[PDB]
Amino acid sequence: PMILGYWDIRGLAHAIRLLLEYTDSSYEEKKYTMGDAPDYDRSQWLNEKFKLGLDFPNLPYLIDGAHKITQSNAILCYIARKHNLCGETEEEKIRVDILENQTMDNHMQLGMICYNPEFEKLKPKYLEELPEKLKLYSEFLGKRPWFAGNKITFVDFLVYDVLDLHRIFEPKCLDAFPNLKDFISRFEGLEKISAYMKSSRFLPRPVFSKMAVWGNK
Amino acid sequence: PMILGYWDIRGLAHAIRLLLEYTDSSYEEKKYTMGDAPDYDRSQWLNEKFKLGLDFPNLPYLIDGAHKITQSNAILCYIARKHNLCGETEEEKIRVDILENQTMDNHMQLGMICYNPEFEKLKPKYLEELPEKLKLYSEFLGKRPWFAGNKITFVDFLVYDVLDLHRIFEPKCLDAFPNLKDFISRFEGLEKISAYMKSSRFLPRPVFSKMAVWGNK
Numbered sequence: 210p211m212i213l214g215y216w217d218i219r220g221l222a223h224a225i226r227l228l229l230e231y232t233d234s235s236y237e238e239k240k241y242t243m244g245d246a247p248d249y250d251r252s253q254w255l256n257e258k259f260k261l262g263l264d265f266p267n268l269p270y271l272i273d274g275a276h277k278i279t280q281s282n283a284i285l286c287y288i289a290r291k292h293n294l295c296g297e298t299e300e301e302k303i304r305v306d307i308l309e310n311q312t313m314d315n316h317m318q319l320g321m322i323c324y325n326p327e328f329e330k331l332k333p334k335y336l337e338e339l340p341e342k343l344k345l346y347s348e349f350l351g352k353r354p355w356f357a358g359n360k361i362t363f364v365d366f367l368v369y370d371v372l373d374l375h376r377i378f379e380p381k382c383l384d385a386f387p388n389l390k391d392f393i394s395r396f397e398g399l400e401k402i403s404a405y406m407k408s409s410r411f412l413p414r415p416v417f418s419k420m421a422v423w424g425n426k
Numbered sequence: 427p428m429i430l431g432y433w434d435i436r437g438l439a440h441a442i443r444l445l446l447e448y449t450d451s452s453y454e455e456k457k458y459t460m461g462d463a464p465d466y467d468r469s470q471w472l473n474e475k476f477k478l479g480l481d482f483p484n485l486p487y488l489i490d491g492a493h494k495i496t497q498s499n500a501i502l503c504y505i506a507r508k509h510n511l512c513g514e515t516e517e518e519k520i521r522v523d524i525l526e527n528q529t530m531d532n533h534m535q536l537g538m539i540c541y542n543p544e545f546e547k548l549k550p551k552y553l554e555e556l557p558e559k560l561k562l563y564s565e566f567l568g569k570r571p572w573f574a575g576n577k578i579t580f581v582d583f584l585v586y587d588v589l590d591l592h593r594i595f596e597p598k599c600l601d602a603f604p605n606l607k608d609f610i611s612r613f614e615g616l617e618k619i620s621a622y623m624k625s626s627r628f629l630p631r632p633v634f635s636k637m638a639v640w641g642n643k
């Protein structure tokens with residue numbers, strides 16, 4: 210069975226875990242524990258980091274037999290390809306590519322301030338800007354059932370994670386975009402998704418690692 | 427003809443410009459000018475940002491008729507797909523995916539400190555770490571003519587820009603990895619590449635925008 214390595218948190222592995230579940234993939238998980246402050250001992254991972262045969266050692270990392278992979282989006286396409294969720298038409302592949310990177314951006318943005326000691330000070334501006342960000346995704350999705358088009362793709366998992374992370378950060382954020390709310394309903398309503406969410410495996414928190422100022426627990 | 431919008435600098439548009447050239451693509455450039463300190467007036471771009479019909483307004487952006495694209499890596503695949511440089515075999519697509527993101531990481535890393543006011547203080551550590559970074563690419567490439575494998579792909583443009591930016595930042599950096607040096611020789615040795623470098627179009631500097639503390643000019 211495949212084996213997904215990551216910290217004992219949600220973070221970046223979220224969309225992957227969801228995808229793996231949606232695809233009925235056979236897998237295990239090698240969760241790494243980070244020590245408490247002030248050191249935040251990472252040795253559990255560092256003692257293994259370069260022993261796994263990974264090309265660019267990192268987290269998350271996926272191991273499927275002889276295939277060792279790093280970089281979240283790389284791991285997602287890998288999985289998605291086995292179930293034709295990496296896109297089909299031309300326009301689909303474009304939307305996929307754009308989102309694939311757009312979400313990664315918007316994510317690192319939140320991550321950056323949530324790990325910034327001055328989070329409290331920065332928070333005001335970030336929130337002032339967020340509505341427009343969400344709007345973009347609303348406009349983008351429009352009347353489509355999924356982001357790529359009529360068929361679901363791995364990018365839907367990425368958009369979800371991002372959108373979800375924001376209802377958690379600011380609950381009223383998605384209130385102004387019905388289609389987005391429906392998207393979340395539609396995504397969580399997915400049979401294998403719904404079931405996974407009610408299982409013991411579902412790890413929706415902590416959102417970030419112990420070093421984080423927000424969602425660190 | 428296609429139209430590539432970006433700042434009047436190298437930056438993220440570099441690999442794209444190189445690819446476009448190597449593919450003999452018919453295109454123009456909409457270069458945006460940033461005002462001098464302390465305001466760094468961006469208005470030339472802001473007054474157009476939401477008028478272009480882009481989905482997620484940003485730079486660089488590519489316009490091919492009805493197709494409006496953002497996110498550098500999104501733009502690269504779009505172009506590479508028209509010429510079969512987006513990867514073919516399974517293992518090829520993996521390497522492409524990994525590098526497509528790996529390079530983007532290593533890039534932002536450099537960008538972050540080069541835009542950091544305390545650049546001078548941060549520089550010492552970054553340099554202490556760089557060798558291992560480069561080594562990863564060397565190990566990765568190994569005895570292959572190209573990163574993807576025997577055929578050249580758009581990621582080779584990404585790896586080049588990164589490797590190039592680092593010889594500029596620290597000339598002796600690549601000295602310990604012959605295969606990487608040969609890679610640089612082999613890439614610039616490409617007919618259309620070589621030619622483009624001797625042209626008036628070649629924009630290798632400034633490396634970053636005016637806001638940068640390094641390579642700002």
Ligand SMILES: N[C@@H](CCC(=O)N[C@@H](CSc1ccc([N+](=O)[O-])cc1[N+](=O)[O-])C(=O)NCC(=O)O)C(=O)O
Nearest residue numbers: 220221267268269279280281282317320321324531
């Ligand atoms: N581009 C890579 C990024 C991988 C990465 O950064 N992994 C991190 C945790 S994520 C992370 C780490 C720091 C911050 N931060 O804000 O400081 C935010 C996030 N995040 O998940 O957004 C890690 O611990 N890697 C193991 C290692 O480096 O050896 C990918 O998407 O796979």
Ligand SMILES: N[C@@H](CCC(=O)N[C@@H](CSc1ccc([N+](=O)[O-])cc1[N+](=O)[O-])C(=O)NCC(=O)O)C(=O)O
Nearest residue numbers: 314437438484485486496497498499534537538541
């Ligand atoms: N993920 C996107 C990122 C796009 C982006 O960052 N665009 C910047 C320039 S790049 C950039 C900007 C800042 C820093 N920095 O280090 O501070 C590094 C880089 N970089 O290219 O590496 C911009 O000016 N966009 C127009 C807008 O936002 O309206 C992509 O790769 O296309």
